[PDB]
Amino acid sequence: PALLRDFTQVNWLNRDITNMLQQAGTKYGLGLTETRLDYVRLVKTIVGHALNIDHFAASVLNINLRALMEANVTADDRIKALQAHSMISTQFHGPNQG
């Protein structure tokens, strides 16, 4: 509804929405934004987008992202899982451990 400002042809709506958006306590924004997680990598850089979406889903998506971001699973971990499933002196080689 914040987008309706100076676009809805309903006068009172525009006046009210303009009031709320000119209050210091509420600031609409859209598109790419400066997150704390900017330039963090996880094969690809993380970025923030101010999306039009309910805050519950926003929250869950953010949770899932940070969940992936903090996992620090590496090749060493999978190599270890393989070694547990291999005859006792098998050797594994390949990816950098990290």
Binding site: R41, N72, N96, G98
Partner: peptide, 8 residues
């Protein structure tokens, strides 16, 4: 001597 990228 870590070389692989990490999030942190």
């Amino acid at each position: 001597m870590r070389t692989a990228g990490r999030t942190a």
